[PDB]
Paper text:
The semaphorins are the largest family of evolutionarily conserved axon guidance cues. The semaphorins signal through their main receptors, plexins, which are single-spanning transmembrane proteins expressed in a variety of cell types, including neurons, cancer cells or endothelial cells.
Sema1a has been reported initially as a repulsive guidance cue mediating the defasciculation of motor axon bundles in the fly embryo. The genetic analysis provided compelling evidence that PlexA is a neuronal receptor for both Sema1a and Sema1b12. In the crystal, Sema1a1–2, Sema2a1–3 and Sema2b1–3 form a disulfide-linked dimer, while Sema1b1–2 is a monomer and the lattice packing provides no evidence for Sema1b1–2 dimerization within the crystal. Our crystal structures of Drosophila semaphorins revealed that the dimeric architecture in Sema1a, Sema2a and Sema2b is covalently secured by an intermolecular sema-to-sema disulfide bond formed by a cysteine from each of the β4B–β4 C loops of the opposing chains (Cys279 in Sema2a). Conversely, mutation of the cysteine residue involved in dimerization in Sema1aecto to serine completely abrogated dimerization, and no dimer was detected up to a concentration of 2 mg/ml. Despite the low propensity to non-covalently dimerize, Sema1aecto maintains the homodimeric architecture by reason of the covalent interchain disulfide bond. In class 1 semaphorins, two distinct loops with no obvious structural and functional role are substantially extended from the bottom face of the β-propeller, β5A–β5B and β7A–β7B in Sema1a, and β2C–β2D and β6C–β6D Sema1b. In the Sema1b ectodomain, the β2C–β2D loop is significantly extended while the β7A–β7B loop is extended in Sema1a. The linker in Sema1a is shorter by 35 residues compared with that of Sema1b.
Residue numbers in the entry:
A (entry chain A): 80 to 181, 187 to 513, 526 to 601
B (entry chain B): 80 to 181, 187 to 513, 527 to 601
Write the structure that this text describes.
Amino acid sequence: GPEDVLKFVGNESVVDHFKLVTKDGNSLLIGARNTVFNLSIHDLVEQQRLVWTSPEDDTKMCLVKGKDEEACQNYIRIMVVPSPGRLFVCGTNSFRPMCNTYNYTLEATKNGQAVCPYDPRHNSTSVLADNELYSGTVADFSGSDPIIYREPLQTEQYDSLSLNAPNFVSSFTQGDFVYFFFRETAVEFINCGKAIYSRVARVCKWDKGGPHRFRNRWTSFLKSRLNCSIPGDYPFYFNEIQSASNLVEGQYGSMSSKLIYGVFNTPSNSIPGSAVCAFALQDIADTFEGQFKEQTGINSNWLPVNNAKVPDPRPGSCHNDSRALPDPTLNFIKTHSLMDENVPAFFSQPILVRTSTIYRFTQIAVDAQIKTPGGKTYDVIFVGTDHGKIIKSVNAESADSADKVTSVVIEEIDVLTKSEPIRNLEIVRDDGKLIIVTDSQVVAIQLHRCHNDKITSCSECVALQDPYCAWDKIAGKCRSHGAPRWLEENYFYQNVATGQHAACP
Amino acid sequence: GPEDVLKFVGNESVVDHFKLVTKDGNSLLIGARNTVFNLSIHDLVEQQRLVWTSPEDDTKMCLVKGKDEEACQNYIRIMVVPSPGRLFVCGTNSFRPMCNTYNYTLEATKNGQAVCPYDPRHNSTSVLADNELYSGTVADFSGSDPIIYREPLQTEQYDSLSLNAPNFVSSFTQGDFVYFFFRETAVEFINCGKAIYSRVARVCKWDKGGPHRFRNRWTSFLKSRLNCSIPGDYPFYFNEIQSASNLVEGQYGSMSSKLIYGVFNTPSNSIPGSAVCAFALQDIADTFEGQFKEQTGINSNWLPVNNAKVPDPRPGSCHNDSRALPDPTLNFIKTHSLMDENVPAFFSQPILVRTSTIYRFTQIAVDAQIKTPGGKTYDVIFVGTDHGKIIKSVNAESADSADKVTSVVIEEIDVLTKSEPIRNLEIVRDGKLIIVTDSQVVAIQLHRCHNDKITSCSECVALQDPYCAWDKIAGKCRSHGAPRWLEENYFYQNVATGQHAACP
Ligand SMILES: *[C@@H]1O[C@H](CO)[C@@H](O[C@@H]2O[C@H](CO)[C@@H](O)[C@H](O)[C@H]2NC(C)=O)[C@H](O)[C@H]1NC(C)=O
Ligand SMILES: *[C@@H]1O[C@H](CO)[C@@H](O[C@@H]2O[C@H](CO)[C@@H](O)[C@H](O)[C@H]2NC(C)=O)[C@H](O)[C@H]1NC(C)=O
Ligand SMILES: *[C@@H]1O[C@H](CO)[C@@H](O)[C@H](O)[C@H]1NC(C)=O
Ligand SMILES: *[C@@H]1O[C@H](CO)[C@@H](O)[C@H](O)[C@H]1NC(C)=O
């Protein structure tokens, strides 16, 4: 396959999953089980190492004979950089999650309940704000009560209408609003059957509490389904979600191209077919302004909610005083938290689909829109699989009656061992490279293979349709973008679905 | 692939689909569009041909500008042999289905409403009885009213609770009870979403009608869902059904192995994964004896039906007098026709599954249980695909904590052109196979123990085919049903019996 530009076999069984990239500090804090590493983004050289050995009393309490000797240790899952500049790492610590703030300077330690999972399963995510941290994970030992913990607010205890077996995969903040991505079991569909529908949620930044003992509960909690289907005469849906990328902004704000890419796939019972579905923050806000989904009982009968029922205060909005908000809508928000309509997919079709293959998508990574010689900018997608095979892709919009979108599969070359599954991905923003955080090791390879790829044929650059690729006449080098600088404006031919028959022959 | 033992390219565009096998008469009546053929089973030689040219007045009424010049003609779909020996064929006749009772001797011609489909779509099936004919097809021109017509009873006009967009794929009779196989849209799940669940139905032999305006309607109509899923921690279902084989009986009646093999697959929107699920008449009768599925309204609320609601007369049973049956159960049968529980799959697992491949299962054929040298008898499965690839398979029962059946895929060799899809299969009782397709029908041997020569002993031993057997002094690979042994001999076979090696 591809030559290993940088390989890093740090640990045998620690199975790193978490990572933080700070380009100004120029250091990569890769989270890990029972260990922490600080490397340089240039050559993957560890600067310092924080090793946290779970106390003896904590490990001695965990004696489940099933599957604990290799596991049930310190799984450092969440980490952010607070405003004072402190170090904030929290581990599971053998089902005893307690956050320890930090260098080995222990500034303070606080209980890590509802911010670090008890199980080592990938079912939690976190994101920071200016003053508070947003984390969604389970609360009890078994994990039956999964809540969102912003200090010190909690949702309704054992509320299935809000959360029922979710797997938080993403979380980001935009304009005093923190969004969450998870796959929970829909209570309304349980009447029909057992299935999981990807539902996005959002909460305001400053929710102080609620009046009349509602101080613990949330007031503006809302959620709505994500519709990731292959449109046509009959819709074919994708139930489960595995990952979701960060928000994408293009050029000025006048453009409405705010795009969020999420990795979706088919449930366990069904075939390993996976699909990359895009969702916009504008498409998300369309359903939240819409009405809520109806919820009736066994005896009482109710019709889909109408506009007469909505109160004067609008649900899901940042107010200056949340406690002064009236109660009739606070008794109303719990029953009608879920929305009626699902968020439509971008351009009414998924971005990338892979059905016949055995492997399933597991992670995702998005690169910035580079300036292609065609005078346009499109988004780049990097999606990993449990097989370990990485797929590079870019998208051009094609006009058709069914809005057929061409899924450009640049190269499907596998980089790591077939056995190990990719569990986290990241792109570096100095030299072009890629981060593939897996259980066995993390390997850094170049982002685009326009350079270092030579089949001794001119056609290689032209046939791939890669945005970074470009060919020169007097020189035999296949040009790239971001690494070389042109002395003056030149001619570069590219075929990003532009309709070019041939060039090299 | 395999050499064409018998070739038969009868027609380029007639697209034959129907066939009737009579072993005593030794003739194969293969039904066809605008033609019908009566052949010999030995060498596929047509004895006589009846050509039925749709009348001019009938064809002139059919002027569908989309795609009719090639279609909208005489599609002979149903045919049985009545007791007098007459010929009873009915064709679509350009959306004018009129049955022709019979050689060209036309004894009588009667309207074929509710027994022959108007459309050329494969959505109807038929089966004969001692005195009446059982047929399930649409009634109107568009096809919105599909009913089951045994002369002269009809279901409720435009009844969605009983039938909603069905595709009748099979129909057979057993003990004064005629069962039907079709894939209709479930009204209760339509509330949740658009999906098709395979539902089997049955009707008694002698239902004259019902009193107090129920004379038109059926009294003993019942149906229940078919569960064709891959069991485990989470069930994965197969929604649509494409075909279903005839009943299988093994040795004496004391054994409970009466099984019907049906071909199932995944809806159109989802992936082409198909599954062959077996269902027993004993498993069918378990759900019909069970309670009925509840059906409530928008305002009224109802709980799942209980045993207190069932009347003293048992629904779905042959009575001596159907008119004397009370009315409170006749007003009850329509609302609660569907059963609550679905028919479980045989051994709680499908027989054969094909998911990763692009081709979909289209038909099915079951061979009789031959006597293998291992002292046992198992069923043989032949399932065709839209790709044209034919797969022969047999299944042996394996004991484990988790029910897992090994699906023996004997040979997956393609016989016909990749383009054409198989649309009907049948086995002959010399060992051969009949592959009725749109382009042509090809007759090839049933088992490939003979006519297969890789010059290696290991080929034969590895196949695990029941008909295959090897000899020591002679290099011939023995078969069953064609050669006769002079005396008892030794034959080694490994139908999942646990044999490491033999030839090397
Ligand atoms: C990771 O290691 C780097 C490399 O030492 C740290 O960055 C330096 O830290 C020292 C000590 O605080 C400072 O004096 C330097 O100014 C930092 N920058 C450079 C370029 O040396 C970094 O603080 C460590 N931690 C993280 C989270 O990045
Ligand atoms: C197909 O043709 C055969 C012709 O043999 C029919 O079988 C009988 O054949 C004998 C001798 O040829 C005739 O005297 C009989 O009249 C035939 N039977 C009948 C019922 O007429 C056979 O019936 C034809 N049809 C099928 C479905 O096999
Ligand atoms: C989900 O999206 C598809 C494609 O646009 C659409 O056909 C389907 O109706 C949507 N789902 C619902 C519940 O509306
Ligand atoms: C279908 O049958 C399987 C076993 O054959 C069982 O596990 C599953 O629960 C059944 N489900 C339905 C809906 O019939």
